[PDB]
Design a protein around this ligand. Structure first.
Ligand SMILES: [Cl-]
Length: 131
């Protein structure tokens, strides 16, 4: 698979406020917010862009604005993933940007996420700052 974030720890920011830390291993995001949590994840590079596929993290763990979760969904096996465009500004500042959703069943081919552009509302985007 894709090891772009594997072994990396980021500070999580939303609306210029720190809301916790996230550490990515081979299979899970390890979240330290109000509480600890884990989320299955994977990264897919299609063309020039990279996309983060991540399970929902509840606000009892990571207290972020709920419309951050308004994005394209991917379903592999029984786990549903929330898909984000990873933007790398300078190898320090990263964004998790929500994508446009569809009026159809979740994508079953990871690469087919590229057929969708960014969400018109980007104000609830996550900022990851590399440690
Ligand atoms: Cl796939």
């Amino acid at each position: 698979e894709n090891l772009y974030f594997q072994g990396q720890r980021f500070e999580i920011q939303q609306h210029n406020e720190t809301i916790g830390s996230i550490y990515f291993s081979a299979d899970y995001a390890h979240i330290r917010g109000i509480e600890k949590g884990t989320a299955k994840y994977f990264i897919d590079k299609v063309g020039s862009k990279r996309y983060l596929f991540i399970e929902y993290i509840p606000d009892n763990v990571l207290n972020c604005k709920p419309d951050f979760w308004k994005t394209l969904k991917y379903k592999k096996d029984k786990v549903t993933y929330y898909v984000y465009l990873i933007e790398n500004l300078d190898d320090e500042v990263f964004h998790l940007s929500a994508l446009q959703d569809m009026n159809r069943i979740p994508i079953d081919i990871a690469d087919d996420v590229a057929t969708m552009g960014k969400s018109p509302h980007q104000n609830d985007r996550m900022t990851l700052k590399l440690n």
